[PDB]
């Protein structure tokens, strides 16, 4: 019945595609053609955080919009003070191969991970003045690509074994194992409600998963390359994906239709990090051509240029209140822009 | 300008000083990427001069060598290579036991040589499995794997042909494949690596000074 099963799967896929086509009736670009275009969004660096020797691979903004955690290949996890350009903490890392870093919503814990297949959770606020690792999470068979915090006790981590997992920090075990993804998952984004999270992989697929359900609900395809960075829309009803195919594409959960494709003829290199702003009007993506572009979400036009990073822009973040942006690049610098 | 901000600035300066001191102490470290095939070559090289990425550290002639074995992770190498981009040299291991593995080993070697990240990164090649290959080549001529081979069934000329075939995939200036053949039974291996490693720094320093 293998042939029958394959035929049934193909028929189901065709039915899904037909339903998606029927649901689509107009283009959002035409809908938002009436609104006034956003003017030239010129930005200037306000501070250049310095003190990484090797190249930076990840950063994360704090809940208070002041402290940010940055990870580089030198093995140092530096918690920054964006306002005063200080170094609150410098946590040495057991393995210098780190690709992701996470800052807990409460602020007490910080997560790091990478080619060591272990997610290290370090407690910043202790009775002693030192920063010690609270717990090392093991069990993944692949390199961790991204991790985000749900609470002080639950963390979601996407690994290189084409899977995601949810860990209870106090228990230290895998409560939920999100599987069923054919590409190496590289990034996950958490909705404000912290119940649905989208993970994008190397098979040009972005899968929506429910925290409580533990099983995939919706799948979005259409990219011509691997997915590198993902970010929910501020309302949590949509998201955007950046891929090596040199373009960013927006998806909506309810519609299940790809809405707009931010592509420019001159731009040809891949995508490392991407994130939305406070209102979702501006979508920031840093590319490999030593530059970052800021796209209008509804106008689909490159309206902002963020230049000054000599090397590849690796990580990008937007503050919780959305007033500032941080771009950490391979040139060992994090630049804060307003 | 206030008090605890002055104390915080003092702590920031102390942290920066400690960070710079740690970085200078990391200057005397040699990062050697290891991207060989895993049939019988990697284990001997790891153990003689001594599941995520495996770091093996050893000191030799005032140099700290750190070998990074990435095998066993079973993932895409396109996400791997860019991380290991600042390594001084790439050690490659080639096993002469199985002729079938030679073709894909050579293809992987060509792919490593042709990466944009490794365009100016030198390669140290290790044709392992000496004695058994010498004993076996008499029974099995180097014809099934390489029909284009037109030479006597001898150990030395066949080894030279293999070395030439491997190094023919360089196709790049400012890069040289330092080739050596180790028995993996009784060797003075690390010393050889040291010599090889030294050259890269000198060459790098030359390009640093503009003398080229």
């Amino acid at each position, epitope marked *: 019945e293998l042939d029958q099963l394959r035929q049934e799967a193909e028929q189901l896929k065709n039915q899904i595609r037909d339903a998606r086509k029927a649901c689509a009736d107009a283009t959002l670009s035409q809908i938002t053609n009436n609104i006034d275009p956003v003017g030239r969004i010129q930005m200037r660096t306000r501070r250049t955080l310095r003190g990484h020797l090797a190249k930076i691979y990840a950063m994360h903004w704090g809940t208070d919009s002041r402290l940010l955690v940055s990870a580089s290949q030198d093995g140092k996890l530096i918690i920054w003070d964006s306002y005063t350009t200080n170094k609150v903490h410098a946590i040495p890392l057991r393995s210098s191969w780190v690709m992701t870093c996470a800052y807990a919503p409460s602020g007490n814990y910080v997560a790091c991970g990478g080619l060591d297949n272990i997610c290290s959770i370090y407690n910043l606020k202790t009775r002693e*003045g030192n920063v010690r690792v609270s717990r090392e999470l093991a069990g993944h068979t692949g390199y961790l690509s991204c991790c985000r915090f749900l609470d002080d006790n639950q963390i979601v981590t996407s690994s290189g074994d084409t899977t995601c997992a949810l860990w209870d920090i106090e228990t230290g075990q895998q409560t939920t194992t999100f599987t069923g993804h054919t590409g190496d998952v590289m990034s996950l984004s958490l909705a404000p409600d912290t119940r649905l999270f989208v993970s994008g992989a190397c098979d040009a697929s972005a899968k929506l998963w429910d925290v409580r359900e533990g099983m995939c609900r919706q799948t979005f395809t259409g990219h011509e390359s691997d997915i590198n960075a993902i970010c929910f829309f501020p309302n949590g009803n949509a998201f955007a994906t950046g891929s090596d195919d040199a373009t960013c594409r927006l998806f909506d959960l309810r519609a299940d239709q790809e809405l707009m494709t931010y592509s420019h003829d001159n731009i040809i290199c891949g995508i490392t990090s991407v994130s939305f702003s406070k209102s979702g009007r501006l979508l920031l993506a840093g590319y490999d051509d030593f530059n970052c572009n800021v796209w209008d979400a509804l106008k689909a036009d490159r309206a902002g240029v963020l230049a000054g990073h000599d090397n590849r822009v690796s990580c990008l973040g937007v503050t919780d209140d959305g007033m500032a942006v941080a771009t950490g690049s391979w040139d060992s610098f994090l630049k804060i822009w307003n | *300008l206030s*008090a*605890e901000e002055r*104390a*915080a600035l003092e*702590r920031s300066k*102390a942290i920066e000083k400690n960070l710079k001191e740690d970085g200078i102490s990391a200057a005397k470290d040699v990062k050697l990427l290891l991207l060989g095939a895993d049939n019988s070559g990697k284990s001997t090289i790891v153990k003689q001069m001594k599941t995520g990425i495996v770091e093996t550290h050893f000191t030799f002639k005032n140099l700290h060598f750190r070998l990074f074995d990435v095998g066993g992770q079973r993932s895409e190498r396109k996400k791997w290579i860019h991380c290991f981009e600042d390594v001084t040299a790439i050690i490659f291991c080639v096993d002469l036991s199985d002729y079938n593995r030679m073709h894909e080993s050579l293809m992987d070697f060509d792919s490593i040589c042709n990466n944009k990240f490794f365009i100016d990164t030198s390669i140290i090649l290790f044709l392992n499995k000496k004695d058994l290959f010498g004993e076996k080549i008499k029974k099995s001529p180097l014809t099934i794997c390489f029909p284009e081979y037109t030479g006597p069934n001898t150990y030395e000329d066949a080894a030279a042909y293999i070395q030439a075939q491997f190094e023919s995939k360089n196709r790049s200036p400012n890069k040289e494949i330092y080739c050596h053949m180790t028995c993996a039974t009784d060797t003075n291996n690390a010393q050889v690596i040291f010599d090889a490693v030294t050259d890269i720094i000198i060459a790098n320093n030359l390009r640093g000074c503009g003398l080229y």
Partner: single-chain antibody
Amino acid sequence: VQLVESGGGLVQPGGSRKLSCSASGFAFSSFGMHWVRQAPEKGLEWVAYISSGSGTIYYADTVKGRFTISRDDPKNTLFLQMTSLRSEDTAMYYCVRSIYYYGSSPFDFWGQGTTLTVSSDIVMTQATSSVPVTPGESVSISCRSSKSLLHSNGNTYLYWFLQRPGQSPQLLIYRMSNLASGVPDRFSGSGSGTAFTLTISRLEAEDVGVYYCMQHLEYPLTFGAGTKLEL
């Protein structure tokens, strides 16, 4: 974490003796530490401060030019060198930890202290000497400052301390709003420049003591007069 101090004793006037303190289960090289004396019947007052790595060394004008402080990080010890002692320097000495970064909690732990017997700044003024209180009743404690304690950074520097009878002092509120670690949520603090308030809703047992003001706007650390709680 434990801070144990020794070297206190009877000293002839005009002499010189050193006091020492050792810390266990604690990171020493990253903390700026303070020596503070308490008069036998009067309130607390500052003595000296050693920074992290001994970058800066500060003294009080009462002991300026006669007192020195030294930290031995490898020895994990702190030394107070005293000379030219006076009959007015008899006091119970306390050594305190203080770590300085964004959102830190300085002065959170106080040592046991050692007794010593001998043979301009911003003034802290507490109007009320003592207040008779009953359990379950809210009590308000006020501090007044000669100069505004609010800087241009956006936070006001003031600390709240409780003097447990026959025990080391404890930290309650730092920077006017943030409770310390392990303190009950009943305590609260608020106010503004020149008018600073502490409130204890639903007062309970073991809360009796003397309440002290503190400032960090500028170095001299003139403490509050104190307010005794009577059961």
